[PDB]
Structure formats: C-alpha cells, structure tokens
C-alpha cells in the first residue's frame, strides 16, 4: 500500500535509474513498475505473482479414475512451495504431494511417470510429449514416434519392380451442407 496504492505483488531490488523529480515508474499499459519507499529512498520493482493454466489428462470414465494434472508454463519448484494450508487458489492442494513429478518444456506433469520407449501419440501433452493409459495400471508419458525407420538402398545400378498388386478401397467423408435456420 505504498503511499496509498492498494496493489498486490512481489517486491524486489531494482537497478533502474530515477530522475530526482521522478518518483513512480510506468510501462506501456499504465501499470506501476517501480516505487520509492517514503521512509527510506530505494528502488523497488513490482512484479506480479506466478500463474498458469491447468489441464487434466484423464482416460474415459469407463476405464478408470486415475488422472494426471499438467501445470503449464511454470517453474516447477513453486508447487512444492505451494504445499500449504490456504496458500493456493485450487482446492485440491493435497494432490500436489502426489506421484512422480516430471518436467517438460510446457510444464510439469504431476501424476505420470516417463517411460523411455516410443509409441504412437494418443493424448498430446505438448512440445513433443504424449501421454497414455497403460497396464497395475497408470498414466505414462513418453516422446512421440513419427514412425519406424526404413532404410531404402541406393546404387548406380539398382531397380525395384513390383510383381503383384492389391486393389484397395478407402473412404472420404465430407460435409456438404449445414442445418438451415432462421430467427
């Protein structure tokens, strides 16, 4: 509440210069980014707290009720510190001290272990990580498998000619029109 300024945030030491008459500091969006303490002169940098999205990696309700909460775009040390009574907006704080904490480029997937094998991507975590439900059952996260490597040969004299064929059929569903409506 610096000199009558009701605001919430984190106060840290700032090296920015102040002109002698200047007191406050402002950014492009008219948000106060610096103050001078009335009692003692100093440079303080107001920075907002940590925030980020939360998702749920759940299989079908039929299959099971084991989930895997992904905390997106946050430094992973915070949710250890977030383990407290009435110190986190989500109520299910008890899950924070849950299963194996894993680290990704997009965030921490609290509730799933990382296997080292590669399979097809079922549920995409983000930035090259995909989760799945596998069997003693659990949600496991791994790296995508673009496909099985194939090594086609090559030489100054080599041709590969097919000797047999298989007539195949496929399908291609396409919308053609939507529901007419009026108001």
């Amino acid at each position: 509440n610096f000199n009558g300024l009701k605001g919430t945030g984190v106060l840290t030491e700032s090296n920015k210069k102040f002109l002698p008459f200047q007191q406050f500091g402002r950014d492009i969006a008219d948000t106060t980014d610096a103050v001078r303490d009335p009692q003692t002169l100093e440079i303080l940098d107001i920075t907002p707290c940590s925030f980020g999205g939360v998702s749920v990696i759940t299989p079908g309700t039929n299959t099971s009720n084991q989930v895997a909460v992904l905390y997106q775009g946050v430094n992973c040390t915070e949710v250890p510190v977030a383990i407290h009574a009435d110190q986190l907006t989500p109520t299910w704080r008890v899950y924070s001290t849950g299963s194996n904490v894993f680290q990704t480029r997009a965030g921490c997937l609290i509730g799933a272990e990382y296997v080292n094998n590669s399979y097809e991507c079922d549920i995409p975590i983000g930035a090259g990580i995909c989760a799945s439900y596998q069997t003693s059952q659990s949600i496991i996260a791994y790296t995508m498998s673009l496909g099985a490597e194939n090594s086609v040969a090559y030489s100054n004299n080599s041709i590969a000619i097919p000797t047999n064929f298989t007539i195949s059929v496929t399908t291609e569903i396409l919308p053609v029109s939507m529901t007419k409506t009026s108001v």
Binding site: I159, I167, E172, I173
Partner: protein, 195 residues
Amino acid sequence: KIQDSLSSTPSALGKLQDVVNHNAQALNTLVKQLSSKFGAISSVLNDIFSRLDPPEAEVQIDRLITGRLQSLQTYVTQQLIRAAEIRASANLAATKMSECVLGQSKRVDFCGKGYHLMSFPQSAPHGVVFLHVTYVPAQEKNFTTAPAICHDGKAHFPREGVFVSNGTHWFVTQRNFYEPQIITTDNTFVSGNCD
C-alpha cells in the same frame, strides 16, 4: 470389409457428427443467454418494466436489448464463418464428384491413396461419403538396370518401359508391374553413337 469396418469403430463418422454437434451447441447456448442480467436488476422483462420508475426503466431495458443484440450478432458472425468453411468444403466435393466420379483423375493423392481407378458416391445426413477404388503395388523384387543398350555401335533407348536384368539376360518391362519381354526394335529407338 467396408461393411464391417464402419460397423466396428465408432469414431469413423466423426466429421459429419461434429457439424451437427456444433450447430446444436451453438443453438443451445444461444437460447440459454435469455436468463442473464447483463448488468441489470433482473432478466425478467415485465419485472424490469414494473418496479423501476420510467426515467431509468430505459437505462436498463436498453442494456438488455443491446446485450441480446450483441448475442444475436455473435451467433450470426459465427454462422457466417462456419458457412464459409462449409462452402470451402462443398466445392471440394463438386470437384471430386466431377473428376473422380465422372472420370479418372491423375492428381496425386486426390481420389484416394495410390493410383486411382474410380469412385462411388453415397449419401449421408448433411454430407456425402465417397468410396475410392485404388491400385496399390505390393510385392517387389530388385534387379540390375542400365540406362541404354548399344548393339550396332548406336544407343537404344527404351520406347516405353525400363531395361532390367535377372543376372543372365536383359529384358524390357513395364514400370508399375512385372512383365518381361525380349528387347526388340519395336521397343527401342536410336539416339546416336554409344560413346
């Protein structure tokens, strides 16, 4: 096989099921915004005419009316964008029905994966389902090949086909099949000295 396939997996008709689902959700959320105050005393119309006095009765029912006009405007804009998407998709069916069905199209991976043979249109609720027939090679053998053959001091390029060899004899064959024939003048044409 097709009969069985669409009967087994339930995620096949996803495309046509998504359009009707989107329309149903849009209509449902449109007819659900009639019970929100939009920053007014109440969402009941005759109630908001009844209690508040005439000078600010409007300062409230204009709020309601412009809010509902904004909701209608959002629904209409969403429908114009969706209809543009459908029209983009609808013109990819007229072209497919024109080329794949009424002819043989040589555009790669347009009328199905592999070499195209024909197609069969079928109807579906608010859509269409094509049924492409394709020619896909499968078992292959590798032979030794040469660019040309000089016999009388002159080159001999293949008319239609490729020169291959099974280790003892040279043959000229087709490309997307295996049919060896003895190399003859009817399959070769000359293009100068072989040096």
